[PDB]
Design a protein around this ligand. Structure first.
Ligand SMILES: *c1c(F)c(=O)[nH]c(=O)n1[C@@H]1O[C@H](COP(=O)(O)O)[C@@H](O)[C@H]1O
Ligand SMILES: *c1c(F)c(=O)[nH]c(=O)n1[C@@H]1O[C@H](COP(=O)(O)O)[C@@H](O)[C@H]1O
Lengths: 257, 257
């Protein structure tokens, strides 16, 4: 029988980052992660401030910010603390352990210094997780494994998806969940976050496919919807985020019973 | 029957970037790509200058450079032109088309403005290639698809590898070859570049596995060896690069007959 987000926050095997997230999802009645896909720092920060109360998480691609600096990230952390949301850098690491360790800690971006969560592809084998965890564990961070993708022709299916689940289970001190289209693990300690979400049917011209919050949360059993253009391209991004929040939240409640 | 690098440079369906590479491999008697895995710009540039005559290509991870600037890349391009080698940013793109397009053209790094070659994982489906090619084709760049990985537990095997080959074939205007452990395509227009190479048996503690140049070029049929730590950790990096160059080159000649 299904446990609420608040009860899942207390599970014996829950990771601290997962428990913090689950508690603030419960408190704020939001299971919406904003995919803040913009190229300007000002717009990122204005969106994070205005939409912070509506979201449990703000997902970044800092490698698209034209005017990235570490001080931008400092100001994002201030907003995350004020409004209570996690920061998730959607870096989709996909290299050998020795290299990802470096890409996560170092370079210009110093991702591990500000991102509560990152994600990784499982294609390299479990060394990708070991390398990240070398940096992530001491910094008390968490990681999601990409078990399925939303795009047309995705190869993250079948035995590949099963491999991601096994890899997560086996690295539960660091791996807190999945990027997936549906519930892929039976274990309630794991979070399921789903990109490829819009209210209307459709896709983009470069292989993105959309499903609705009711489909993803209600029928497919995922926990959190990740929404970019459905919000970002709207005129009123605050009302769009509220639309998505209410959709995902009610789907969750109706699945809970 | 096997064609020399110089004859492959002339194939009807050869991509211009591939033909430039193949010609300079022939001219310089090198099929060695240096994996310049360092965190300092000065060291990157000192290695590129000293080892430039020994290599056909210099592979970067700019997201590990602590002191990246676009002026560093300008100085790398000067060295690439002086010594005649290509620049390959080993970014291993692995997101939806709409996003990779942005990560390749934009952000701080402006990768497409200086990298002759990039590479991509095939897991997202062919939209990853379409998104990159939107930026790459107008800039006359090329891309490699990651058909196999060198690390323990790699999922890039079997039908996944076959999918990468099909995806390359179908995007031959932009895709010039593979990252792979062995020849995966029959078509001589495609380049095969192989990381995970050292003269001695071994690996690292984070899942890297090594095979020798003779094994990779001679028995497995690949074209170019990518070598990082085997060179970079040596005391004399110039003599190490020469060792690797002579190994890969003689393996190539002996396979040619
Ligand atoms: C990453 C991923 F691994 C997927 O399976 N799907 C996916 O779209 N991405 C990232 O999620 C966001 C979707 O944004 P939207 O299509 O709602 O605008 C993007 O940031 C994409 O990179
Ligand atoms: C990338 C890749 F897709 C592989 O299959 N294997 C691999 O190692 N990488 C990159 O190649 C270089 C290997 O360096 P070395 O082990 O020789 O030091 C690294 O830059 C790695 O990221």
């Amino acid at each position: 029988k299904e446990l609420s987000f608040g009860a899942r926050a207390e599970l014996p095997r829950i990771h601290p980052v997962a428990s913090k997230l689950l508690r603030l999802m419960q408190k704020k009645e939001t299971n919406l992660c904003l995919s803040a896909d913009v190229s300007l720092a000002r717009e990122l920060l204005q969106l994070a401030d205005a939409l912070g109360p509506s979201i449990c998480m703000l997902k970044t691609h800092v490698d698209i910010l034209n005017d990235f600096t570490l001080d931008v990230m400092k100001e994002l952390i201030t907003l995350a603390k004020c409004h209570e949301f996690l920061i998730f850098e959607d870096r989709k690491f996909a290299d050998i352990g020795n290299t990802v360790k470096k890409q996560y800690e170092g370079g210009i971006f110093k991702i591990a210094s500000w991102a509560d969560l990152v994600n990784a592809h499982v294609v390299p084998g479990s060394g990708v997780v070991k390398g990240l965890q070398e940096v992530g564990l001491p910094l008390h961070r968490g990681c999601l494994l990409i078990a399925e993708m939303s795009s047309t022709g995705s190869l993250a299916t079948g035995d590949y998806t099963r491999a991601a689940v096994r890899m997560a289970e086996e690295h539960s001190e660091f791996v807190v969940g999945f990027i997936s289209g549906s519930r892929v693990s039976m274990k309630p300690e794991f979070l399921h976050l789903t990109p490829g979400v819009q209210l209307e049917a459709g896709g983009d011209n470069l292989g993105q496919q959309y499903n609705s919050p009711q489909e993803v949360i209600g029928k497919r059993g995922s926990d959190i919807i990740i929404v970019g253009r459905g919000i970002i391209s709207a005129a009123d991004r605050l009302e769009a985020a509220e639309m998505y929040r209410k959709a995902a939240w009610e789907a969750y409640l109706s699945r809970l019973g």
